[PDB]
Amino acid sequence: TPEMPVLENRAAQGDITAPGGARRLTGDQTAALRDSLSDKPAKNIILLIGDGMGDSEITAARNYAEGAGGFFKGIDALPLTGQYTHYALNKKTGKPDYVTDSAASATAWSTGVKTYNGALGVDIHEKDHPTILEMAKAAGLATGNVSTAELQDATPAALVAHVTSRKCYGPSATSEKCPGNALEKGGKGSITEQLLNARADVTLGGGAKTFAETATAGEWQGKTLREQAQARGYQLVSDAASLNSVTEANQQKPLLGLFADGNMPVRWLGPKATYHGNIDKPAVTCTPNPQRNDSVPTLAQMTDKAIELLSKNEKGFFLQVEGASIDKQDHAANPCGQIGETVDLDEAVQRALEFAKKEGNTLVIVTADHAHASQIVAPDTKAPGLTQALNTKDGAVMVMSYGNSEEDSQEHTGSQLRIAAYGPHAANVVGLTDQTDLFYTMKAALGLK
Amino acid sequence: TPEMPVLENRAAQGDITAPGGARRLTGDQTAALRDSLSDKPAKNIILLIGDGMGDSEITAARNYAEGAGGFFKGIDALPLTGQYTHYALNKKTGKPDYVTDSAASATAWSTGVKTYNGALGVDIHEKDHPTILEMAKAAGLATGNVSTAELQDATPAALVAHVTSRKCYGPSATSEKCPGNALEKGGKGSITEQLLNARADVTLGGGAKTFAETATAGEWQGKTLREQAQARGYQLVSDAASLNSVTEANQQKPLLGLFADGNMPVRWLGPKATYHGNIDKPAVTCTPNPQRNDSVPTLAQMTDKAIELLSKNEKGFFLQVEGASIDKQDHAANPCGQIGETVDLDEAVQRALEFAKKEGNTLVIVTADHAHASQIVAPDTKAPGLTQALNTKDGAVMVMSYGNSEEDSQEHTGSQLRIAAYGPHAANVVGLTDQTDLFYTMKAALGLK
Ligand SMILES: [Mg+2]
Ligand SMILES: [Mg+2]
Ligand SMILES: [Zn+2]
Ligand SMILES: [Zn+2]
Ligand SMILES: [Zn+2]
Ligand SMILES: [Zn+2]
């Protein structure tokens, strides 16, 4: 019994050139929205973050993959929607820094405190604040942490580690960039060491590389972090078959999936955007990346297995899933990698909704940490930045532009962006809210102290 | 009691550097949302359009005027929000054209049919479709059309005109660019001539210039459009005191206010953005326009005046208010003008909401016709385009970048964007919708046949 409805189909209902044909609605939505409102407790929370997936990115991706009048069966199917602010702070002044990085933002929703760009799980005075994940676990809930990036990257790291700089991946960088956190200096350790201490039930992503580092102190000095993980009782999996093999994941036997040395392979290949690329160069059709792999689980497969594993815990679970590479390909000004990552996220959202619809007590939230550079501009545009023309599903040309930096990497932007949710407590994302409100929304939905 | 609540306080709750200090919400919003939902018929509708007012635009303006943690008492106060799509169509192919102009988008909300860039009140086969304004009149409702641009501009023109080119301001341009619409060649006439026929109860904006033009055919041949107007019973006003004097406006004595020759003056002045301005030039503090005049009514006063007059109508009213210059100052790469026109619209929204709170049967809508170029970037950004650093209310620097055009005009972008609403039938803007759905929601809310 699907008590709470998801939006089944908001594509254009007919011929886009005729009166009414471009409509996404088929009648009045009052009753359906009323039906979507419940203040019942949530047993579970599934948080889905598209890194750098602002409104522009969602739009670009839908145009390409589904057509202008198409509809993301995952992404767009959430019925309660609003916009949220993600500004960070200046460490020195305490004033807003209008354009956050991935670390400050993730700290925001995972602790409820704003912070400076580059920080993870600490405020501007460098104090540690518990994360929603540490809280959930303290409360007896099963916990999951899933990303396509290296596990040390800002997004997934924010839930498990509190370091003064997001660069502090392992022992080596930590000694140098985060002296105060360094193990050998009496600190809590590097991001990777804290991730191992945090012990979520399920952790799946890339970044095996840093696991080859050896600890500088403590019980496992001299051994590699990979070796400490095994010594600590973690089940290590490194390919989709092994992941599929897992039947249990808990505090006694927690799961650690390391599927790449660095970030996981992107879904789609395309050339990088160029100066006047839309005028000089022919239109691009994105193509599947041969290195993607059958041996490499996709995001939706990771999401599906975590939910399976976590759903066995009777008090409920907290799960965050990251579509990491949307931001990474947006910095690289690679349309194809970018949109291909958003499609990949949409598949993961679909798995989360199928579960929640059935369960009836699951709040699913889909948003981004911040906005990014990409823009959709007219086909004959002559822009100072990098552009590329792409052939969409509609059989038309869309041009994408990246013109926010002369430097090599395209930059984040400060615009407020879409947050959407489904399930109990979802009402709290409607309207204008702040990214820190999301921590409180989650805490409250879960009934956490 | 205003059963229908408006968001009263969505500003950050306390000290932004402390846990929970940046929250916008005071508690759970489920109940409040339940209470904002009604399927009752709307008696009145007030549609407020910020031209080019995408999420980026709202964010920049809020940051500057209200601070990062601030809140627009009008714009941000609408409780039901979503994101809508505004793509246009390619005239030849009927395939989507991902980035719309102001005419195609206005046509979409005003008629319910997608069209080509440059079309007003016609579809891709150059055929006329009735507009919401036309239909409301036909039904006996009072009608209003207000804007700070030239009244012949795309936005206001779309409610009252059907021309193949938005450039067809008057007889002269019409005979040249829209022959088929030319009064002489048997057409409905130029935009201004059709505006005179549509006979809205209240029409307020700029564009006096074109009214000096003389009619080439019809009953008022050889007379200027101004004479034709007074000749057809319009009550002409050209200033605030004249405007204030009006005690009635109706089909018998319709009101026509021409407050300026071209566009009404912008609120705020500032320098244009320049290459490396955030680096090479000092941060800018916007200056009030000394020449904006006490003799020229502000958008909010026109708004307040239109409601008083239209509201005398017992059957109900439809009203359209445009903050036209956000878009034009976005094109001009002028942060101060762009932001100033957003603050200006916010004051108009407040007026609409105040009336709506009290009346109880008013559906109020706030959106934009498409997205724009401006982006909020990091202070030390080195961008290939035009930039400016600004000093905000927080006492920090915000940087704005315009980098999607090498030409002297910064372009529109195709991102989906916020649409927000308050009152009866407002659920219809929640989630993902298309700009065409807005026509259908308004028509059904009012019960127009
Ligand atoms: Mg990330
Ligand atoms: Mg306009
Ligand atoms: Zn990020
Ligand atoms: Zn990034
Ligand atoms: Zn426009
Ligand atoms: Zn424009």
UniProtKB/Swiss-Prot annotation, chains A, B:
This is Alkaline phosphatase. PROSITE patterns: ALKALINE_PHOSPHATASE (PS00123). It catalyses: a phosphate monoester + H2O = an alcohol + phosphate. Disulfide bonds join C168-C178, C286-C336. The gene is phoA. It is an enzyme of class 3 (hydrolase). Its EC number is 3.1.3.1. GO terms for molecular function: alkaline phosphatase activity; hydrogenase (acceptor) activity; magnesium ion binding; oxidoreductase activity, acting on phosphorus or arsenic in donors; phosphoprotein phosphatase activity; zinc ion binding. InterPro entries: Alkaline_phosphatase, Alkaline_phosphatase_AS, Alkaline_phosphatase_core_sf. It comes from Escherichia coli (strain K12). Its cofactor is Mg(2+); Zn(2+).
